RNA sequence: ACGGAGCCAGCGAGUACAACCUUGGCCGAGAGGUCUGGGUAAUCUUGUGAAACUCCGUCGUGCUGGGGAUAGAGCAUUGUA
């Protein structure tokens, strides 16, 4: 409704986000995952990652 | 500066006097007498390789050993 | 016999090639000679001053002979080396582009380099003659 | 031999013996790569000691030191450029340069800016962290 | 009589021309930062502010200072159209006054106030 | 240390709904401008011919050409800034 209600958020840390909740810190963007490093340890083997060595 | 680097014509007389008949001839040897210090000794040694006089052994930059021509 | 470039040592090859060019003086000069740093990171200019370019142009020609097709950006990366970027670790960045480009532009008109397909610069027929003649001349110097 | 040791050039000292460039670096303005650029115009050997020179070479060099755009320089190997309103460039290489910087520093103090305020107290200007650097001050 | 002090300006000849050379002519005679900034699109940067600065000199009481044009936009460079008016620079604690001059040219509004209280 | 000359690795990574890695060619003393591609990747960047090193020259034991901090002016680029 109001005119000014945004910023150029097409880059940096504020615009980027995870899939689960939306944390702006500790973000894995490798291979287009977008799941933060706390939840990645929980969901490693379901995706297919394993601790071989 | 500890002297013996400035170019003098009086010294150039005594370089040719003390050139022949020596075991050790190099950049390491001539600077011990307080002759042309550092690089000007290399230029002084470069004169003595042209017209015989003193013949070489090693041919490296920083390791330039020579010996008298028997 | 088997007269090739590889029998002559690579460092000794350029010495005979440099003197060959300075007799003629027909390899051409760009204009940036001795107003030059040489690379993107290099405190002192060229110590050789006179000659200099003829050493550079010879070493570019022999590398174009061995390989299929060499370019400008790769030659800058090959000649270029280390830096001293303040109080940090030493990095690697390309050398001067304007020097190595005008080597390739001038050698085309003299009669060495040729325009190849896809991308890069290969060798002419008359370019292989002058490479072998100086290689044969260097073979006579050794033997 | 031993022709002259100091040997002045625009009031500043130019010590005898040594070299072309590294004796000229004594001038408050000339450096380790400018004197080579100046020596290139006159065409003199860097191999020589340079304090023992011909008389014409000193006067030929000083003309190149004063005038930048006349002699063969690209006009981007200069110390200072652009001063006053809308126009030209110029530099200096003697006691002129040290005096020029003090007058040019007063311009920053007169306009009174973030640099000029910092220059009054003797603190770090270029956005450094002053929680460590230089435990002495001046 | 002619020269009082000296010309207060950028790099070269004389002052007089600066008063009647809006922005585009001023940008030509400037360093790398002002040229690159003004080359890009300035929308609501000199739009809202300049209408007050020009209108203040109409409303001024002849010879004395015009009214203070307060500024959140302290990223603006001092172009020579408004040499004479005062501007209020926002640190946080009140809009602080800055008197613009032809000496103060080619500089930002923020640097004539400073936001930390010691020195 | 400062010059040329010689010239060799392995782990990786990488856009099509975005703006990724980007050779080859021109402009430039640099940084970087631009025309073009190729690559969804033992296919194109890429042989990621990376450094330290090798070998002839320039300096030689002097806060020195070692060392690079503080400083000033401008030329570039990423960005609403």
Question: What structural keywords apply?
Answer:
part of a larger assembly, 5 chains, A: about 55 residues, mainly alpha, 30s Ribosomal Protein S14, Chain N, 3 helices, B: about 70 residues, alpha+beta, Arc Repressor Mutant, subunit A, two-stranded antiparallel sheet, RNA-binding
Could you characterize the architecture of this molecule?
Chain B: Keywords: Ribonucleoprotein, Ribosomal protein. Chain B: This is 40S ribosomal protein S25. Chain B: Belongs to the eukaryotic ribosomal protein eS25 family. Chain B: It comes from Kluyveromyces lactis (strain ATCC 8585 / CBS 2359 / DSM 70799 / NBRC 1267 / NRRL Y-1140 / WM37). The structure is cut from a larger assembly and holds chains A (53 residues), B (70 residues), C (143 residues), D (138 residues) and E (119 residues). Chain B is α+β, with helices and mostly antiparallel strands. Chain B is 33% helix and 9% strand. Chain B has a single domain (1-70), classed as Winged helix-like DNA-binding domain superfamily/Winged helix DNA-binding domain (Arc Repressor Mutant, subunit A, Orthogonal Bundle), CATH 1.10.10.10. Chain B contains 3 helices and 2 strands, in the order H-H-H-E-E. Chain B has a two-stranded antiparallel ribbon with strand order 1-2. The termini of chain B are far apart. Chain C is mainly α and 143 residues long. A two-stranded antiparallel ribbon of chain C has the order 1-2. In chain C, strand 1 (113-115) and strand 2 (121-123) form a beta hairpin. In chain C, helix 1 crosses helix 2, helix 2 (53-66) packs across helix 4 (97-110) and helix 3 (72-79) crosses helix 4 (97-110). Chain C starts with 9 loop residues before the first helix and ends with a helix. Helices cover 19% and strands 11% of the residues of chain E. Chain E contains 3 helices and 3 strands; from the N terminus they run H-H-H-E-E-E. The longest helix of chain E is centred in the middle third of the chain and has 10 residues, at 50-59. The C-D interface holds C 34-35, 43-45 and D 32-33, 36, 40, 74.
Tell me the layout of helices and strands.
This is part of a larger assembly, with chains A (53 residues), B (70 residues), C (143 residues), D (138 residues) and E (119 residues).
Chain B (H helix, E strand, L loop, with lengths): L8 H9 L9 H4 L8 H10 L5 E3 L9 E3 L2
Antiparallel strand pairs in B: 1-2
Chain D lengths: L7 E2 L2 E2 L7 H4 L9 H9 L12 H12 L28 H17 L2 H8 L17
Antiparallel strand pairs in D: 1-2
Helix pairs in contact in D: 4-5
Chain E lengths: L23 H5 L3 H8 L10 H10 L9 E3 L14 E5 L4 E5 L20
Parallel strand pairs in E: 1-2
Antiparallel strand pairs in E: 2-3
The structure holds one RNA strand of 81 nucleotides.
């Amino acid at each position: 409704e109001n005119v000014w209600y945004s910023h150029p958020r097409k880059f940096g840390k504020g615009s980027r986000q995870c899939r689960i909740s939306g944390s702006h810190s500790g973000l894995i963007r490798k291979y287009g995952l977008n799941i933060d490093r706390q939840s990645f340890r929980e969901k490693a083997n379901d995706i297919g990652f394993y601790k071989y060595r | 500066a500890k002297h013996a680097v400035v170019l003098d014509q009086d010294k150039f007389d005594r370089i040719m006097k003390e050139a022949p008949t020596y075991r050790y001839v190099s950049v390491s040897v001539l600077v011990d007498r307080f002759k042309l210090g550092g690089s000007l000794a290399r230029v002084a040694l470069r004169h003595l390789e042209n017209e015989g006089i003193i013949k070489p052994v090693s041919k490296h930059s920083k390791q330039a050993i020579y010996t008298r021509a028997t | 016999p088997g007269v090739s470039v590889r029998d002559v040592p690579a460092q000794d090859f350029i010495n005979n090639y440099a003197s060959f060019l300075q007799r003629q003086g027909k390899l051409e000069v760009p204009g940036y000679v001795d107003i030059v740093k040489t690379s993107a990171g290099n405190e002192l200019p060229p110590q050789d001053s006179e000659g200099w370019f003829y050493k550079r142009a010879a070493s570019v020609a022999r590398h174009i002979y061995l390989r299929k097709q060499v370019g400008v950006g790769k030659l800058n990366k090959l000649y270029g080396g280390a830096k001293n970027r303040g109080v940090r670790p030493h990095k690697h960045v390309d050398a001067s582009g304007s020097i190595n480009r005008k080597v390739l532009q001038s050698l085309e008109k003299l009669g060495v380099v040729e325009i190849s397909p896809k991308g890069g610069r290969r060798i002419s027929d008359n370019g292989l003659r002058d490479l072998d003649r100086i290689a044969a001349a260097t073979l006579e110097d050794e033997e | 031999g031993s022709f002259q040791h100091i040997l002045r050039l625009l009031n500043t000292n130019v010590d005898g013996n040594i070299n072309v460039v590294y004796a000229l670096t004594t001038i408050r303005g000339v450096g380790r790569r400018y004197a080579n650029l100046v020596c290139k115009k006159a065409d003199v050997d860097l191999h020589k000691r340079a304090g023992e020179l011909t008389q014409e070479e000193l006067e030929r060099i000083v003309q190149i030191m004063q005038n930048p755009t006349h002699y063969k320089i690209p006009a981007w190997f200069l110390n200072r450029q652009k001063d006053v309103n809308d126009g030209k460039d110029y530099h200096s290489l003697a006691n002129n340069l040290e005096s020029k910087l003090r007058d040019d520093l007063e311009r920053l103090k007169k306009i009174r800016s973030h640099r000029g305020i910092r220059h009054f107290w003797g603190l770090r200007v270029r956005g450094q962290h002053t929680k460590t650097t230089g435990r002495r001050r001046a | 009589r002619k020269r009082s002090f000296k010309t207060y300006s950028y790099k070269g000849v004389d002052l007089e021309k600066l008063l009647e050379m809006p922005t585009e002519d001023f940008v030509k005679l400037a360093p790398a930062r002002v040229r690159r900034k003004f080359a890009r699109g300035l929308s609501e940067k000199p739009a809202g502010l300049m209408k007050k600065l020009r209108a203040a000199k109409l409303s001024a009481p002849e010879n004395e200072k015009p009214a203070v044009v307060r500024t959140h936009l302290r990223n603006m460079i001092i172009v020579p159209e408004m040499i004479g008016s005062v501007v209020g620079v926002y640190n946080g604690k009140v809009f602080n006054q800055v008197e613009i001059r032809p000496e103060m040219v080619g500089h930002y509004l923020g640097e004539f106030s400073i936001t930390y209280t010691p020195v």
